[PDB]
């Protein structure tokens, strides 16, 4: 809210993010969602990717978004120079390149965390959400890019999650657990629950 | 809907067939409105859609509720008790149903068309049904049911299901004029695909 | 019967000296006792579904799916608050005063010994007999905590077993806490023979969740 401004995103105003609509209000969130809807459906249409990496996270974001935003497919740890000349302001000490860098060779060395149990998928899969967490490297849109991130990770080493059937507040308390101490314990029981069928249609039995 | 006296003189408690009140009124209407849905369903479709079906639907709905079933506000209405009801001043309803009826005759019901061409049709006859109130209680579901048999026997298919009551509220008060938003909902709405990727953030 | 969180946990000594958090096996507390409890009633509700229906519904199997679901929790777990019990700290809990539970769990074993656990049954006495019992178990607490899953897992088996299925799913909280109120309060057990009958048709199953 007072972040996106002060980064020099929004116009004088204090809250309209810039974009390509030049739209404002509920008109730029309607235009918004049905540009993101139509991308998560293409999406869908293109194959796996072979290798994961920050390089297609970025492609994600960018195809999420390169209807709505100039800056697409960049992070936030580089200034960005809008198409009026216009430029974006660095959190200081954001540690985004050196944690982005940090994740490429955990998913290189691991192989995508392919060939591997579910028990040992969620282990090492609940390290490298949290460290994505912890350092956000796009200014609008993280919850949505990491999510489909994950998602089709899972699909490439024979697992699937459903991030349908997890409350935003339990997602919330699992974040703040190992980020406020170092408990991964209850990151661990989401992915576990989330990577059980039989849990997940038993939760949309109780999703009400 | 206390402006226009169809509750009682408490302000509240729309006047109904079962002498009830508060939370078992509540409970008692939506009991018989769902037995109701499911008799409309074991019907079959009509031959053409015109304003008298609209009053139909919202007739078979209401009837063990309410004494003015397939009765529209734009004229004043009469109750056993001897009571009237007010009509609201220059509501063009009926200029309205009419001018829906003419649409839907020489389109055919929306039927040989394009989905892309669908979705301009239904959007504008929707609009007009929602500018102008024909029922005092009750639009929404009767208008759901309306045109989602309308598309059914146009070959498309719109599920309702997967809108926000802050989405719609908005796509009426855009042409109310920008269609837009009204588009891009019933477009998501005749798109099976779409439709799948809505039902996985419904958190 | 209490009101915006329960004074009631706290003052039968079901609860620490905060006043609000539950006695648990774990020491845990706020949150993270929220979470560490869903997740082994999750497992626990996973588990009840792998073992077979058992042969006869009684009072004796509601405390033993209580029991299931509370056991890694509570050290209360299959136990009714009808009788005092006894942590391992020493310290003991309150018993509510005429509450009815023994002589209500009693009731409702006859009844389903008599009725042959409700199997044989056309629908609409289905719906009339698990009314009558659902209320009962309602009007009475057995458990200081958990009555709303065991309940529903309680007749979800034994409408299965009678050949006929319960959908809690479609039923939204404010609807059953009126149903419960209205024959609670010469009781109006209509609102209640509404919602099973609802819950006990699939087609309306279907229809609630597309609206």
Sequence with gaps: HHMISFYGYTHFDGRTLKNKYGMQGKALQERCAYDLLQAMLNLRKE???????????????????????????????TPFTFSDGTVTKVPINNKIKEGLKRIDQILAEKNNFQGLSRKEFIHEVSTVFILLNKIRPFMVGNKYVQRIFFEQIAEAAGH?????????????????????????????????????????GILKEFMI
């Design 47 to 77: 194959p796996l990717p072979e290798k994961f990496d920050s390089s297609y996270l970025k492609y994600l974001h960018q195809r999420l978004y390169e209807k709505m935003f100039e800056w697409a497919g960049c992070t936030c740890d």
């Design 160 to 200: 699937k999650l459903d991030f349908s059937v997890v409350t935003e507040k339990r997602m919330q308390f699992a974040i703040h657990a190992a980020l406020s101490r170092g408990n991964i314990t209850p990151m661990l029981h989401l992915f576990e629950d989330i990577s059980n069928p039989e849990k997940v």
